[PDB]
Amino acid sequence: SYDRAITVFSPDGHLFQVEYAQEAVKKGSTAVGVRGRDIVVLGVEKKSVAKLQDERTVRKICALDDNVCMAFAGLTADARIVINRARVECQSHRLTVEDPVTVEYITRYIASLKQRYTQSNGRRPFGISALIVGFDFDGTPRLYQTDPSGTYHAWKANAIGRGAKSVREFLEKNYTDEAIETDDLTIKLVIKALLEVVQSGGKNIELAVMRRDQSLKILNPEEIEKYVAEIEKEKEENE
Amino acid sequence: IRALDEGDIALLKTYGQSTYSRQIKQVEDDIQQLLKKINELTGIKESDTGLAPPALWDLAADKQTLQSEQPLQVARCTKIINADSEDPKYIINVKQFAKFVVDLSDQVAPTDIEEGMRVGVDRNKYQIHIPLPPKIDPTVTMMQVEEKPDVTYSDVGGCKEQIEKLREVVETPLLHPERFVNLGIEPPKGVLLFGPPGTGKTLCARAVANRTDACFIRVIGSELVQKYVGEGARMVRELFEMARTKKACLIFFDEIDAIGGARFDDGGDNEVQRTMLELINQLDGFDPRGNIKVLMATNRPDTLDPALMRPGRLDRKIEFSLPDLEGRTHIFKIHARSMSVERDIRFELLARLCPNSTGAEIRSVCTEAGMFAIRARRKIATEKDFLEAVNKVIKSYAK
Amino acid sequence: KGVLMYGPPGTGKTLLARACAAQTKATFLKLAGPQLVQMFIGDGAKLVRDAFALAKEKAPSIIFIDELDAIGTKRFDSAGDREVQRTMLELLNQLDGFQPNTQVKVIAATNRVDILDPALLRSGRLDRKIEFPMPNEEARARIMQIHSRKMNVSPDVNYEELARCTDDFNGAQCKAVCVEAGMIALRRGATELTHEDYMEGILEVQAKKKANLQYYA
Amino acid sequence: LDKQIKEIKEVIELPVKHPELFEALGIAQPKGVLLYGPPGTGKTLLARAVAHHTDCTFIRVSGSELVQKFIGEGARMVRELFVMAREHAPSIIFMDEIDSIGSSRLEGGDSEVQRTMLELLNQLDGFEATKNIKVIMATNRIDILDSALLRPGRIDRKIEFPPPNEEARLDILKIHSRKMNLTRGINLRKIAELMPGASG
Amino acid sequence: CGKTMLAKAVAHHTTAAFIRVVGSEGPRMVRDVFRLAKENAPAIIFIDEIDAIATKRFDAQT
Amino acid sequence: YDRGVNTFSPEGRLFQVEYAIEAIKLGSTAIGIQTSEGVCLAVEKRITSPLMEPSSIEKIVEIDAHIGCAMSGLIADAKTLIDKARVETQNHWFTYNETMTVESVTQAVSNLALQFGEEDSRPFGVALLFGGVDEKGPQLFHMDPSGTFVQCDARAIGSASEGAQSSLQEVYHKSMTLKEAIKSSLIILKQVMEEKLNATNIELATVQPGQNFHMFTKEELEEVIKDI
Amino acid sequence: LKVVSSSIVDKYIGESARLIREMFNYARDHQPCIIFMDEIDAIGGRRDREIQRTLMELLNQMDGFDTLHRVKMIMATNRPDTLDPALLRP
Amino acid sequence: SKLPLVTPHTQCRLKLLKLERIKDYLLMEEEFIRNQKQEEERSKVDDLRGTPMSVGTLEEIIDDNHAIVSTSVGSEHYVSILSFVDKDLLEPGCSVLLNHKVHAVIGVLMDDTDPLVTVMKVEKAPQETYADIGGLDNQIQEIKESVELPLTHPEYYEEMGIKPPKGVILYGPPGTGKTLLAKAVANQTSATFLRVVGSELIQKYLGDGPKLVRELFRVAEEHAPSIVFIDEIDAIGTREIQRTMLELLNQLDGFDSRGDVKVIMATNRIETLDPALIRPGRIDRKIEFPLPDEKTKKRIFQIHTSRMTLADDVTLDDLIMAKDDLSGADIKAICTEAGLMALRERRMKVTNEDFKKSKENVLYKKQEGTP
Numbered sequence A: 001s002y003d004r005a006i007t008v009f010s011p012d013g014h015l016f017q018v019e020y021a022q023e024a025v026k027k028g029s030t031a032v033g034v035r036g037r038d039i040v041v042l043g044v045e046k047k048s049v050a051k052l053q054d055e056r057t058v059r060k061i062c063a064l065d066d067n068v069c070m071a072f073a074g075l076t077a078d079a080r081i082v083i084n085r086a087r088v089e090c091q092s093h094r095l096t097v098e099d100p101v102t103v104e105y106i107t108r109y110i111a112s113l114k115q116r117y118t119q120s121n122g123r124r125p126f127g128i129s130a131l132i133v134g135f136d137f138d139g140t141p142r143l144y145q146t147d148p149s150g151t152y153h154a155w156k157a158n159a160i161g162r163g164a165k166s167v168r169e170f171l172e173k174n175y176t177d178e179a180i181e182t183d184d185l186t187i188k189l190v191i192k193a194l195l196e197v198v199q200s201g202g203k204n205i206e207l208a209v210m211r212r213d214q215s216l217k218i219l220n221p222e223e224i225e226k227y228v229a230e231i232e233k234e235k236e237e238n239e
Numbered sequence B: 001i002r003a004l005d006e007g008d009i010a011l012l013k014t015y016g017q018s019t020y021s022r023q024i025k026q027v028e029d030d031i032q033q034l035l036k037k038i039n040e041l042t043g044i045k046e047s048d049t050g051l052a053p054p055a056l057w058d059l060a061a062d063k064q065t066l067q068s069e070q071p072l073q074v075a076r077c078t079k080i081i082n083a084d085s086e087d088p089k090y091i092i093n094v095k096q097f098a099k100f101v102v103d104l105s106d107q108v109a110p111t112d113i114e115e116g117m118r119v120g121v122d123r124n125k126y127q128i129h130i131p132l133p134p135k136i137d138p139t140v141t142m143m144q145v146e147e148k149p150d151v152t153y154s155d156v157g158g159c160k161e162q163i164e165k166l167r168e169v170v171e172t173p174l175l176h177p178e179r180f181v182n183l184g185i186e187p188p189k190g191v192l193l194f195g196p197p198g199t200g201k202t203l204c205a206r207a208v209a210n211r212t213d214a215c216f217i218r219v220i221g222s223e224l225v226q227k228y229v230g231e232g233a234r235m236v237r238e239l240f241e242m243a244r245t246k247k248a249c250l251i252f253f254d255e256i257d258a259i260g261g262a263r264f265d266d267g268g269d270n271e272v273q274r275t276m277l278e279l280i281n282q283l284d285g286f287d288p289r290g291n292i293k294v295l296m297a298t299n300r301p302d303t304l305d306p307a308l309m310r311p312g313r314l315d316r317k318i319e320f321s322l323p324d325l326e327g328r329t330h331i332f333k334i335h336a337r338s339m340s341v342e343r344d345i346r347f348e349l350l351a352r353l354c355p356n357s358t359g360a361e362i363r364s365v366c367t368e369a370g371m372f373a374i375r376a377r378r379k380i381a382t383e384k385d386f387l388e389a390v391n392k393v394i395k396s397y398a399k
Numbered sequence C: 001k002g003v004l005m006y007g008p009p010g011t012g013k014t015l016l017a018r019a020c021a022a023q024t025k026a027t028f029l030k031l032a033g034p035q036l037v038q039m040f041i042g043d044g045a046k047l048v049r050d051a052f053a054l055a056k057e058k059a060p061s062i063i064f065i066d067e068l069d070a071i072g073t074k075r076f077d078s079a080g081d082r083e084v085q086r087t088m089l090e091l092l093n094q095l096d097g098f099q100p101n102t103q104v105k106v107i108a109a110t111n112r113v114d115i116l117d118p119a120l121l122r123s124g125r126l127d128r129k130i131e132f133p134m135p136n137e138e139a140r141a142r143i144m145q146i147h148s149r150k151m152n153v154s155p156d157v158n159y160e161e162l163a164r165c166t167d168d169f170n171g172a173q174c175k176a177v178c179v180e181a182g183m184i185a186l187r188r189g190a191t192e193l194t195h196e197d198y199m200e201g202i203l204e205v206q207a208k209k210k211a212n213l214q215y216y217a
Numbered sequence D: 001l002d003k004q005i006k007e008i009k010e011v012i013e014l015p016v017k018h019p020e021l022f023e024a025l026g027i028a029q030p031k032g033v034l035l036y037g038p039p040g041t042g043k044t045l046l047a048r049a050v051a052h053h054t055d056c057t058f059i060r061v062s063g064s065e066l067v068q069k070f071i072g073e074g075a076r077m078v079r080e081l082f083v084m085a086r087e088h089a090p091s092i093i094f095m096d097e098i099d100s101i102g103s104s105r106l107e108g109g110d111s112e113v114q115r116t117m118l119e120l121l122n123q124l125d126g127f128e129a130t131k132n133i134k135v136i137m138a139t140n141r142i143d144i145l146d147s148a149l150l151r152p153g154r155i156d157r158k159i160e161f162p163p164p165n166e167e168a169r170l171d172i173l174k175i176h177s178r179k180m181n182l183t184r185g186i187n188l189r190k191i192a193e194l195m196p197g198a199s200g
Numbered sequence E: 001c002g003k004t005m006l007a008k009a010v011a012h013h014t015t016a017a018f019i020r021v022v023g024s025e026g027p028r029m030v031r032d033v034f035r036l037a038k039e040n041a042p043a044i045i046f047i048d049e050i051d052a053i054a055t056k057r058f059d060a061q062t
Numbered sequence F: 001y002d003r004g005v006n007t008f009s010p011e012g013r014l015f016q017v018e019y020a021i022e023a024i025k026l027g028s029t030a031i032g033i034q035t036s037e038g039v040c041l042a043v044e045k046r047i048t049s050p051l052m053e054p055s056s057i058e059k060i061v062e063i064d065a066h067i068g069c070a071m072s073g074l075i076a077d078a079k080t081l082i083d084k085a086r087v088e089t090q091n092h093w094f095t096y097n098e099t100m101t102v103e104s105v106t107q108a109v110s111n112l113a114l115q116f117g118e119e120d121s122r123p124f125g126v127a128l129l130f131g132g133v134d135e136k137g138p139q140l141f142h143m144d145p146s147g148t149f150v151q152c153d154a155r156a157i158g159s160a161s162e163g164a165q166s167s168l169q170e171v172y173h174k175s176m177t178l179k180e181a182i183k184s185s186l187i188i189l190k191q192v193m194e195e196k197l198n199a200t201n202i203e204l205a206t207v208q209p210g211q212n213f214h215m216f217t218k219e220e221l222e223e224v225i226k227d228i
Numbered sequence G: 001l002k003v004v005s006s007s008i009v010d011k012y013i014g015e016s017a018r019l020i021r022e023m024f025n026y027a028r029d030h031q032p033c034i035i036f037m038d039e040i041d042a043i044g045g046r047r048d049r050e051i052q053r054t055l056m057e058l059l060n061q062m063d064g065f066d067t068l069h070r071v072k073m074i075m076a077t078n079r080p081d082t083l084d085p086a087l088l089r090p
Numbered sequence H: 001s002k003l004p005l006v007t008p009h010t011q012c013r014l015k016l017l018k019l020e021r022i023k024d025y026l027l028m029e030e031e032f033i034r035n036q037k038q039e040e041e042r043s044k045v046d047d048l049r050g051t052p053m054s055v056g057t058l059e060e061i062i063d064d065n066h067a068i069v070s071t072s073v074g075s076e077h078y079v080s081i082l083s084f085v086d087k088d089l090l091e092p093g094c095s096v097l098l099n100h101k102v103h104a105v106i107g108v109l110m111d112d113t114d115p116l117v118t119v120m121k122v123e124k125a126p127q128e129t130y131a132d133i134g135g136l137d138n139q140i141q142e143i144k145e146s147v148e149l150p151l152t153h154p155e156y157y158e159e160m161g162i163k164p165p166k167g168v169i170l171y172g173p174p175g176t177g178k179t180l181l182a183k184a185v186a187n188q189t190s191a192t193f194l195r196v197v198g199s200e201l202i203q204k205y206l207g208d209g210p211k212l213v214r215e216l217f218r219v220a221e222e223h224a225p226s227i228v229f230i231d232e233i234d235a236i237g238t239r240e241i242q243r244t245m246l247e248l249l250n251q252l253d254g255f256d257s258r259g260d261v262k263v264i265m266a267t268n269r270i271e272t273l274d275p276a277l278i279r280p281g282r283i284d285r286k287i288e289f290p291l292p293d294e295k296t297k298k299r300i301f302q303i304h305t306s307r308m309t310l311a312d313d314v315t316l317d318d319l320i321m322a323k324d325d326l327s328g329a330d331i332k333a334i335c336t337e338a339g340l341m342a343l344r345e346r347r348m349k350v351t352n353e354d355f356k357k358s359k360e361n362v363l364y365k366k367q368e369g370t371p
């Protein structure tokens, strides 16, 4: 009994179609998220804006809460589907529950939706993975990752997509156990990887920041290039 | 861009050229031509035929024997006419040449020749004078082990009961037939060895080969599976008659699962099944098998044909399992016996450290300790070395 | 003029053929199915025809074609095996076709009668189909007595109980029980084997104890 | 095909006719070219003419010839074809409709198709004895083909053969009418204009 | 209707040799058929009820 | 006989659920011990990278103040089964006010598990250990994708189940103190399973009848680390 | 003339085709005659080499029947499906 | 024999001087050769074997100087053996010289059959070297410890008591340098090299798979110190093909004693291979060939563009950077494609823009997915 299906097991017992979903995630572009001392920062790469393709429309970064933000790496159609579902869920939870939304609940929601969609015949799993950053961890930053197997884990700093093998090791090389003083330092550190992954072009670092109390914050390419120049000065020290 | 014109090529293949390339090109070309000249001058390298050391051979005996004897042709004998038991008149079937009715020379005797017999025959009167040994297939005749593998029973660890059961059938009746005969019991004549790969099956086979005195023949799947139909069955026939020629013999079919596959029809391989049926018929069919003891090892006991597992063909089935703690300590002792190691190595600690590791794993970990040591250039392996090896191999399996 | 003997491996078919060859006093041709197939293009049918011709030339003759499962198999198989088909067809028509063949009796043995042709399993060729079943319990006791005839058994061996333990045993497995009891008596060094040795042999021969069939699904 | 013919002169002819540059450049010679276009667009004709001018030998095997009915036969055919080409001095290997054995196979027998395309790719990748040995591949409608052979270390270049235009129709009509007895008052240009989108 | 009949008649009257294969009878077979044609220069090849192999093309599955 | 559970083998076995057992085998190892002092469970995280929060992998959980759990397998739907167990305890206690017998909790989880060919999906490819205390006895129980379930004294599931089970069987007896059971289980885990104990990959949870609080082990492992 | 078809088969190169040709020549020489080849599938199966080359010779000798010979032929088989459709042609 | 290695490559006076020294020595060889008994042993042996002498096949040896011999006509002859024939060089299947008149056995002819593995014997290993491969330092050490050092220096292992490792698996993305390392280790120790690439052992006949494996290992034993490189072990390794696996596994770790032959296998898809094929007792060294990192990629660029004439402006580092997405084979393709771009513009001396365009085009030769 070979894989050939979603709801059947090979004699080993692993659902290879879930593996195919995770490889479908692997074929997507880079996405590396972190949490800092107080703030959470993100920068997406591989914009590859081709002239008439005005880069704003595709919306590489989506903020779906009073304050929470992420798009989805993989195939973007299911990304926007989970976007609509996240909008509905966050607004409905804020309306119905005695207290507003927390990042843990919404991450569990996404994981459960992915699992429930997967757990049936004739229903394609979302081949999409995401990195969620939220503020209301009792007023503290925390980062989560969601995987098409319907799984959710917590990270101090994680990378998924085309750089998953590389950037993660980069993080394992330099994620300071010292809580990042001057969260702009964490922003420079993450911008370094977000650039170096895509040829450090300086054009696709498209970035968002939230200090775990603020609403959504965005970084324009010039202000991000400021952190890029600081990182270049830090790297030039070896002389 | 316009294509590279001949003038463009000519300009390009120079100018950028150095001030030596012309001379150096003429030098390498002359090197090549004069190397051909050396080859021609030295001529063709001599090809020999093998004439032994000169002092060893010749004497007038060789040429005298050449001019005096007869280079006999080889024939099958057939249909001893024996029209009166006084003028026997045997038929011969000299292969690829002819068939003749012929008589004996003055040397050989009627009791010497039988039907078949692969006789030898003179070249111009076709008289019969030599009894030649029968035809044995060269692949079948090389199948005999000849050189005894160096591993003995004492080099097998943990399998006390399995080795005891195996030696009861394959070794004891040959060594001490009086035990069985004076007690009036017929010993079993077939053993199957089954267990996970790398558990030691072939190893205890080699051990048997050591302690064995009678003829030992090695068989693997590829030996019997020919492309031609019935030829594998033919090989099985030749193998068993060769074994019958010996005064008692052992046959060992490693990887019997290669051909022992159970019969299936609505699908099959069939020809492999035909060879396996010939093997079954030889093992236990019409006519006594003889003093031919049989040993087979397989990684798949269930896959073999049910007729092949049947007692009388595989009387005793021996299971080799992943060793227990004591067995793991014993195999560690056995493998570290040869190695250069520090004295007080607590082998039981590693043995308990081992997960469900086959004996092959123990050999591999010992070799890995040896390699770490030789990489460090130290002449003695240490406990830290063995721990590092244990890790290496277990994480390598874990991947 | 045709007797096909059949049954699962371990009943005694080959033994029956051997006994029939013993107390007959006639020309006996013994062969297996793999002997007939051979490599060359026309030689297998030649072998079958020559065997039958020899049987005629020594008219009181019985041919024991053992392992008929080899040459005999469903015509359309799986095909480069058609040589086996032709040899088998020569056998087929050397049993009943055109010229009759009398005074040449044929015995055949197979374990896989489902595999065989609907042709060489006919009624004109193999008139008698003799089933060899699993030995019944008095049959098992008789078999153990037969094989332990000369092993110097104990004066009290409860063969009936052995038959009760040895369900699903074939006759060869009963002989295996006997020889295993002898070997176990040798391990004890006992000059005569007894009932406990037979129980231990039954444990040795029987099976693989299956597995955890409540974990199963 | 003048543009296409010029590209294929460059890539094939230059290493075979003037290897010294690639020695002076040091770079290893390019191995082969894939040819793709609608069926009938002179691909075999172009390969045959290139082999004729380059003075090296022409060996052909269509992809459909490779398949066979038995496992281990496509591999043997490819390996012995490469042996023949190597034994035949400077040579170009031509394989028409290579897409027949190079296509979407991940759908899932099919085993021998992969064991053939992988073997061909192994023969060309190992640059086996590629002293003046070249290969040429032809495909109808490139899209059905797979990238496994076009991967950079493998076969190096692609050439497109669109349907002949008005000027190309003029040539081909002239060439194939050169032997036919034509009559004054003929107006072949109207004929070429009247045949839009011919495949040659 | 006489499709093979007239072909046979033509083969008899002319110096041609008449080789026939029916479409129900892979590519190696076609290669051998045309090669066996090549052995006799004026020989004729005939495909009987060809349509089975020459059916309209599309994306083939198996 | 490959498309699903609704096909029977010649030997009757369904060629779908044995693959779910092997799916148990691909998961992280998990251990459970039943003693008259307290019921304990242990689990290996397989923390892919320490940059993860080790507590994030919920391979050790608390269903309720009297009952904790561990699992091995695909993990993803194991959390769903824990959710069902928690809703079971909540509903039954809020309605009847009598404590849910851990036997009954396992029975309810089994009733959920029997919903792949028994109505109108696929078996939950994961196995579970439950450890609980109740007014009538402290118990430990085991659950597998087939929906069958058994009371055990010393249980092990997941990868390396056989060797860990053998050692756990050899160390067990009926009158052990929970301290000796915990130490034996931990040293077994150290020798066979991965490596020396540390807070970022091992987890332990134990429950006692008179204790409805802190059914976990957390931020106190140091004493063991120096004294294991 | 009665024939077990497998009897036609011989291992020498091209001997079986000669055997079939000679059989039909004996048929023509000793009229009136009836040729009964039985178990035809043995040499009449759908298209190991020599059997096909011999079926070709059987086809040629069969088609060589002029209207005048007093020669007729019977073929018997138990698996007519396996028979080559070449024989099935009128 | 072959000419020595000339290892300046730029056209300089040093290269010419080395070639001139080679020229001088070869000219002295010319001079020496141009500048220019055992008739009793000849008249004895080479006249007993009176010309012509036929060639046949030895079947069996029955007595001390009597053997059974076949010939091309297929006949069989029992004929004596004259004393000068080396007995230990005589075995069944051996090609043997025979006196034309009385078929006397007059010498073994060194084998000229079994042509498949005969051509399989590479002997053309010297195209690569450890120098030619750059950056595989850990893998170089692994292969050295595994296959090379036991062949070059078995002394350490015999002194220590280790039976050295004698089977290795190489795995990683294609074009990372697996075959390169295999050929390089074949060159560094001059033990003969045998290659057989995966699916080519798969055959239509029932026999030729296991038979091919058997004769391959037989010839490997015959050459004694030998390397058997199973490239694309995948195709066989991932009943008949399983039987070929069984024969290969038995020939790796089975009965008899295998001897000195080393076995190196290469795969792209290690995780898919059958666990039996990777016998942890036998396949004790698994070696990963990951995609080259920055230092490696620099080394590969240096070695491959070294033989190239270069302009001043090339910014080699900026060529490397990126996110290590290209293996060594892709880098060689970059080098060749940049050379072609330079040639198109008529530069016999490549520039930076050539490499930039080359890398951009080669990277364009990747991926097909839209979202």
Ligand SMILES: Nc1ncnc2c1ncn2[C@@H]1O[C@H](COP(=O)(O)OP(=O)(O)OP(=O)(O)O)[C@@H](O)[C@H]1O
Pocket: B280, B284, B285, B307, B312, C008, C009, C010, C011, C012, C013, C014, C015, C016, C109, C110, C111, C143, C146, C170, C171, C172, C173, C175
């Ligand atoms: N009824 C019986 N009486 C005596 N001995 C028996 C009996 N049944 C079986 N045996 C013994 O068991 C064996 C039976 O095997 P036998 O040679 O008859 O082949 P078989 O059962 O027909 O097997 P196969 O079909 O594989 O050839 C013999 O060794 C015989 O001594």
Ligand SMILES: Nc1ncnc2c1ncn2[C@@H]1O[C@H](COP(=O)(O)OP(=O)(O)O)[C@@H](O)[C@H]1O
Pocket: B155, B156, B157, B158, B159, B196, B197, B198, B199, B200, B201, B202, B203, B204, B297, B331, B334, B358, B359, B360, B361, B363, H253, H254, H281
């Ligand atoms: N009980 C044991 N004692 C000593 N060495 C062993 C034992 N079991 C296995 N080995 C070692 O592991 C290897 C196992 O090979 P083996 O299992 O005989 O191959 P196969 O599985 O093909 O029969 C042998 O080379 C042997 O050296």
Ligand SMILES: Nc1ncnc2c1ncn2[C@@H]1O[C@H](COP(=O)(O)OP(=O)(O)O)[C@@H](O)[C@H]1O
Pocket: D001, D038, D039, D040, D041, D042, D043, D044, D045, D096, D097, D138, D140, D172, D175, D199, D200
């Ligand atoms: N430009 C051309 N000039 C002359 N003849 C042509 C031209 N293009 C095609 N042809 C004719 O049409 C045929 C094209 O064959 P080809 O394109 O190789 O077919 P396929 O596309 O199936 O490979 C040639 O044999 C040639 O005779």
Ligand SMILES: Nc1ncnc2c1ncn2[C@@H]1O[C@H](COP(=O)(O)OP(=O)(O)O)[C@@H](O)[C@H]1O
Pocket: D125, H132, H133, H134, H135, H136, H173, H174, H175, H176, H177, H178, H179, H180, H181, H266, H300, H303, H327, H328, H329, H330, H332
């Ligand atoms: N580390 C390296 N050093 C030098 N060349 C390399 C390296 N890695 C790959 N190559 C290039 O790749 C080719 C070898 O690819 P390889 O990985 O051996 O093929 P395969 O994937 O079929 O084993 C050679 O032409 C070589 O130039």
Ligand SMILES: [Mg+2]
Pocket: B284, B285, B286, C013, C014, C066, C067, C109
């Ligand atoms: Mg029998």
